[PDB]
Amino acid sequence: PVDFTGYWKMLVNENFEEYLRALDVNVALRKIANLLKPDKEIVQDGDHMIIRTLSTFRNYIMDFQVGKEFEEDLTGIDDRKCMTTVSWDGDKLQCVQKGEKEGRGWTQWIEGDELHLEMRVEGVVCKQVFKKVQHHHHH
Ligand SMILES: CC1=C(/C=C/C(C)=C/C=C/C(C)=C/CO)C(C)(C)CCC1
């Protein structure tokens, strides 16, 4: 069965600037973010999912139950709140983020040792791919 648990190091990060611009992330933060190579530390524990998006500058932490809508606090990204649901779709994880921006959400899946993440908002697409790694990063 598909299991996202692991530490995943960024390999490629396509069109991130335009994704952040579509979220109205301010220009100074976009400049910082353009130099980052965020990683993912994930624990899948039943349908309780923890996804820590980690960077040297700032993290964004998700901690939710698959299937259950929650209030997602996007402080540190665009500082909005979304009513968000993450759901299984076969071997993929689908996320719908209801709120100010149309078409906001993402899809996450695995191909071999690669974690794939397509982030979407307002018709803009950012695609990230991470490689599973084994050297422990201190919490
Ligand atoms: C803008 C910005 C950042 C963007 C984080 C994003 C966009 C996280 C998306 C997480 C998802 C979609 C998780 C499912 O794997 C981080 C915090 C890296 C650094 C500071 C500024």
Swiss-Prot record:
Function summary: Cytoplasmic retinol-binding protein. Accepts retinol from the transport protein STRA6, and thereby contributes to retinol uptake, storage and retinoid homeostasis.
Domain of life: Eukaryota
Protein name per its UniProtKB record: Retinol-binding protein 1
Alphabetically ordered keywords of this record: Cytoplasm, Lipid droplet, Methylation, Retinol-binding, Transport, Vitamin A
UniProt entry tagged with the keyword Kinase: no
Tissue specificity note: Detected in nearly all the tissues with higher expression in adult ovary, pancreas, pituitary gland and adrenal gland, and fetal liver.
Single Gene Ontology MF annotation: retinal binding
GO cellular component: cytosol; lipid droplet; nucleoplasm; nucleus
Effect of R58E: Decreases cellular retinol uptake and impairs retinol storage
Gene assigned in the entry: RBP1
Principal subcellular localisation of the protein: cytoplasm
Region (Important for interaction with STRA6): 21-31
Record: residues binding all-trans-retinol: K40, M62, Q108
UniProt feature coiled coil, ranges: none
